[PDB]
Amino acid sequence: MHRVMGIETEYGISVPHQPNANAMAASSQVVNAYAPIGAPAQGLANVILTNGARLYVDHAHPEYSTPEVTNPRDAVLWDKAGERIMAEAARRAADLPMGWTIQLYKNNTDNKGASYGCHENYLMNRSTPFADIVRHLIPFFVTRQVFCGAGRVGIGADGRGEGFQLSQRADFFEVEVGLETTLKRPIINTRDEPHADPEKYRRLHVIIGDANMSEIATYLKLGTTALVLAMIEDGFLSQDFSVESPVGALRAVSHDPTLRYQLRLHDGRRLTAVQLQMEYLEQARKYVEDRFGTDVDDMTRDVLDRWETTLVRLADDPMQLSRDLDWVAKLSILEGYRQRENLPWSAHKLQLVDLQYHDVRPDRGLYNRLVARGRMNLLVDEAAVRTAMHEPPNDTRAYFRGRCLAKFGAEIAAASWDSVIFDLPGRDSLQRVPTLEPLRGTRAHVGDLLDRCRSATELVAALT
């Protein structure tokens, strides 16, 4: 599989025993405690890291945005590195004089009414009609939470309805299509800031997904979506999967973790979320055969196979997926508490456990404690994750960005997705090197050049 993509994750943040601590100040401490090993991004803390990622305060939250990658396995890897970066940043923040003790959560709600975002970004061709993107992604986004959901205790935006639901974010979305990300949240966000030539490219800005801990969930989330987008772009999909009341269906699907809720399609068909997902899987399979046949790459085949297998197991018995899906693993933990301690779904302790699942600390987060016991299926190994904290992917412009920050960090004034700004001794003016093509500036393009250059001056000279 090959499509430029990236994940932004806004982290939940709290300062224990300082319950009214200013969240912007706490977020700033986190980012500023990690900033010694990045460069300012082009008045809150906002930096680029040597792995090509952005780390910044997005109003009330610290946010980590992966470098651009080309496939869902690398998306998992550099997104997981972001969890390690957040944990280390909070650890370092506490070591600084007057530093606060700050807890961070890779989730989407504080269970107190606030909701924050885990955004997926997908490079698309400008020539794809946005109406087609909307028509074909709304039913997919409504139903993919049967394997993408992270689980949530509490029903409704204020979390006071009693029960468990598939997704953290479903209750906070109110419209089908629109521009905002924090109010009147739209299933299809229309932000158009491509960080590339807008005549050729669109960055599809997806805001509906829960942050996932499980690598299988993040992999399926990004991979299945990317396959659906390939069908949209070519014009492959003939069927109209439109659902009658998309916002209502998003919530109803989430509120039924038995996976029996039947959606009403515009054509009167009644399908479960799993069944509509199966119709997307079967279309994906016909599309890959028609465009690739037996020449399908191994990662595309793996995503197709895992997507199909997961849907069959969800239909048979979702609990056999506890090593794979966040909502299933979390539900398993929660049902254990309900059995051991005779707790109803409204018990406050279950909302604490819900949040603990997402704690970035290796010994305190419940997902991390499952991984420590080898109880979750993983796609990458920890050695690779640690490397990915500091080194970029080799096959996007993040390579050029991250390696320049590592090797020429003394001469970088700022950087962003679309440029690196150099300060050369003896040159009066700052030197802006644009990086407009997401697939230029790879190790194949510039690895040897960067190896050879001993200074930013030699690099900048070579590029003009």
Ligand SMILES: Nc1ncnc2c1ncn2[C@@H]1O[C@H](COP(=O)(O)OP(=O)(O)O)[C@@H](O)[C@H]1O
């Ligand atoms: N042209 C593109 N196509 C797809 N992903 C992109 C593109 N440019 C940047 N990205 C990815 O988009 C995300 C941008 O993060 P951020 O700056 O937080 O975006 P936002 O403008 O939504 O806040 C990153 O994960 C980055 O890798």
Ligand SMILES: [Mg+2]
């Ligand atoms: Mg962002």
Ligand SMILES: [Mg+2]
């Ligand atoms: Mg944000």
Ligand SMILES: [Mg+2]
């Ligand atoms: Mg975003």
Ligand SMILES: [Mg+2]
């Ligand atoms: Mg932006």
Ligand code: NA
């Ligand atoms: Na936002």
